[PDB]
Design a protein around this ligand. Structure first.
Ligand SMILES: [Mn+2]
Ligand SMILES: [Mn+2]
Lengths: 503, 498
């Protein structure tokens, strides 16, 4: 049975409110979440991480932040559309949404703003740099099935040792987890553990995009192949996601229902803006873009999406009043026409499949990989892939980012090439006499990250035989937190500085 | 009169407008269109590289004009939601014509918040200083305050009050005064209508008409409107458009759109706390020292005063992260007292605010709530805005914009016939520098100059006066549309140091 009062959970993990609360009181809780996010440093840092182009002098080109804002507006429209559609069907009160219209919209909007919040400095390639660096260090595949005669893991405490013990199972998970950094999983870790934001359960469910655990080592079940596409949460947040599943009535591996909407807003906004920026960067003219889109659509008919959306924008751009630029006019109507077709479709799909979406078990996206709407989105991606993401300036930035994050990890390698007693001594005494380098390296790590390491390790049972395994897991999480929390420019700056090349 | 917001929340447009019935849902979709136009505008994106108080950092820990505008948007949202909730509790929502405009009402406020500072020139208050100073020395608007004077210090022949047989001197008077009162709020109206051609809804544009004084105003403003006419609100170049707007929004002369008080209140609130949070991040003073500076600057300290309920409270929560805890609850405690006060003030004065004639702010002195804000401001002035890094940036920004204007003097030091020849033939043989300088001007600005000039009657004796005005707006558009970093770059590039 569908009752959104049971999914839109306004409680918090810490210092929680309890007890009935009016519509207006519930409104205030979710607006509090809004203020927490908007004033978060993690949101402000998005204006200096890059979205496709190198982020140059005139802010003409999008950043992770301005992209998110554009995405947030698409998510707002879908939510408004779903709700409006439901009011006309008379299902509003029946679905328990009559006193939750605002929060429903707000949760979607903030989840849009908050994708990419856990993304490392150079996007897809920073993740790559992290996971590649730890794979050569941990070799999780040599921990697949029972000890290997010669384990290539660099760490004594993690080596799959002597054909015995369950720990081998914990080692199996730790090694896999640390080699599957994923921005979405880091986002949950960020809003809960690092920033200590104390969001509502509903809000955090909205950024839990995938439900596969990072330590998962096999093929995902046939029934959940889509919701488990990428890792969604880390080993370190397993207890927290457990409490979240209970609070949001999630089965294991089930998704929060508003996540499908944010996912659709991502899918829509994923590309068009990058073409507009490509025209700004003078890569091709708007005229050339129309023909690249005309060519890649192929099977052309009077009546198709192409005709109704992208051909429409091309004609409007030719002979307009409102003294607007041709390119301004083309892209404005490319954006609007795309929204007018793709938002209602996403909203309807949400409603048509609301039972499985509510249960969180619906193994599909709103813009289903089959549909004609997904074909329009594939159209934009095909052009962007062959003509924008391949541009040398973009590709070089990707090369540069990979070397920067890779090199940074080596600079902090000393902190990992240390025994437990050694690293622990560095945590208690601020100045360790015989470890001058590791000392100073330790203090560069942001205070929030060191605090989360101390807090996590202190919650462990001191005497357990798995303690050194857990400590190392948290030590690595400490470093990955520090790196992934940087901006593109900060990480570039620290790299050059710690190799001594700035003044 | 009587209060009906169906008459203020005007969803028509200036160009290619919608007319005809429109259901509640349709009107919502119109106002959601404005949202998409604004959020996707380059002019909002340029806000992430214009500075809000502190120099830009390599890790964006510090606020920019964009992050600041987002915080202001959230405060505006709350005040709007609060007014609507109070009004439903009073049973006045349908009574005031708002029951089908709840959405738009909130959205117009939210966007107006995001869109203040959109017209601000690069280095903020000081780019404004640079522009007005540079044109003051070229146009000397005070030398047209009365009868023509024998020695008109205006550098422009056609703008000197010639001899003494004209109402053309009256237009000269306005042009000279207008061009020396560049004001970001007035530039914002120009930007969203003429330059970006966003074709926003009348209500949405009325929301950013913050002040009602024309930039060409030369004397003392009336006692009944001294607050609404504090700073200039629109330029001579937009006079006719602001006339269409006043009609569409049912504004008397010098009257304000009612939702502007809400945006204005959100600005006043989130204006200062964030800068203190940043001051602590940059390790200028500790949160402990900051507490004591606030205790001391509150002077007359006592009881269960607003200090005790808001800042002393936030100090206590922080003693059990520390800086985050203090500022999280400092912002929150401040909102919880000041947003309802504004929502109350707005409803308590809704007749005058609806007529648009209320000569006060929603907060405005008197109140203990304004005393709280003044406390944040007084501490920020004595301890943050006085920091040398801030003051150096303000010095540098002033030189940059001043120098940039001097680099483009040649475009201004040209006759009409010469400048016009430069607009048609792109290559003018004998003007190599002026030619190349002219092309550096953004296409959107050049295009707005052409449209402006073409609407004029060619034969008129005032034509050369208008062209110089539009030529000057052309330069001011170009400069004010830049970001902090681009302007610094262009300065260095054109002075040749890269
Ligand atoms: Mn995205
Ligand atoms: Mn402001």
């Amino acid at each position: 049975q569908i009752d959104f009062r049971k999914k839109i959970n306004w409680h918090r993990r810490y210092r929680s409110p309890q007890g009935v609360k009016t519509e207006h009181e519930i409104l205030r809780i979710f607006e509090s979440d809004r203020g927490r996010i908007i004033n978060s440093p993690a949101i402000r840092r998005l204006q200096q991480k890059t979205q496709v182009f190198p982020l140059e002098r005139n802010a003409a080109v999008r950043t992770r932040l301005t992209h998110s804002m554009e995405v947030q507006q698409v998510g707002r429209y879908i939510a408004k559309e779903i709700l409006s559609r439901l009011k006309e069907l008379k299902l509003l009160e029946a679905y328990g949404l009559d006193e939750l219209t605002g929060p429903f919209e707000s949760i979607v909007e903030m989840s849009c703003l908050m994708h990419d919040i856990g993304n490392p400095p150079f996007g897809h390639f920073g993740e790559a740099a992290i996971n590649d660096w730890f794979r050569q260090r941990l070799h999780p595949e040599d921990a697949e099935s029972q000890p290997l005669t010669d384990d290539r893991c660099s760490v004594a405490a993690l080596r799959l040792r002597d054909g015995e013990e369950p720990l081998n199972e914990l080692r199996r998970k730790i090694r896999q987890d640390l080699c599957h950094f994923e921005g979405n999983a880091q986002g949950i870790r960020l809003v809960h553990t690092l920033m200590r934001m104390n969001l509502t359960w509903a809000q955090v469910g909205g950024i839990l995009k995938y439900t596969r655990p990072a330590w998962w080592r096999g093929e995902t079940p046939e029934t959940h192949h889509y919701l488990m596409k990428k890792p969604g949460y880390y080993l370190s947040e397993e207890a927290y996601i457990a409490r979240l599943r209970k609070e949001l009535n999630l089965a294991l591996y089930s998704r929060f229902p508003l996540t499908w909407i944010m996912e659709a807003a991502d899918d829509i906004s994923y590309c068009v803006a990058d073409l507009e920026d490509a025209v700004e960067k003078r890569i091709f003219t708007v005229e050339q873009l129309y023909h690249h889109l005309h060519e890649a659509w192929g099977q052309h008919e009077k009546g198709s999406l192409f005709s109704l959306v992208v051909e429409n924008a091309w004609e409007k751009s030719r002979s307009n009043s409102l003294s607007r630029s041709t390119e301004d006019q083309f892209f404005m109507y490319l954006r609007v026409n795309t929204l007018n077709k793709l938002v209602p479709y996403a909203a309807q799909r949400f409603i048509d499949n609301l039972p499985a979406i509510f249960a969180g078990t619906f193994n599909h996206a709103l813009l289903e990989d089959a549909s004609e709407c997904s074909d329009l989105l594939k159209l934009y991606k095909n052009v962007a892939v062959k003509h924008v993401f391949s541009h040398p300036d973009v590709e070089r930035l990707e090369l540069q980012g990979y070397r920067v994050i890779s090199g940074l990890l080596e600079i902090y390698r000393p902190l990992l090439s240390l025994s437990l007693s050694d690293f622990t001594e560095l945590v208690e005494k601020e100045r360790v006499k015989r470890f001058p380098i590791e000392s100073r390296l330790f203090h560069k790590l942001s205070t929030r990250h060191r605090l989360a390491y101390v807090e996590a390790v202190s919650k462990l049972p001191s005497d357990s035989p798995e303690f050194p395994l857990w400590e190392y897991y948290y030590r690595c999480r400490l470093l990955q937190d520090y790196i992934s929390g940087m901006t593109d420019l900060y990480a570039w700056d620290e790299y050059r500085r710690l190799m001594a090349v700035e003044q």
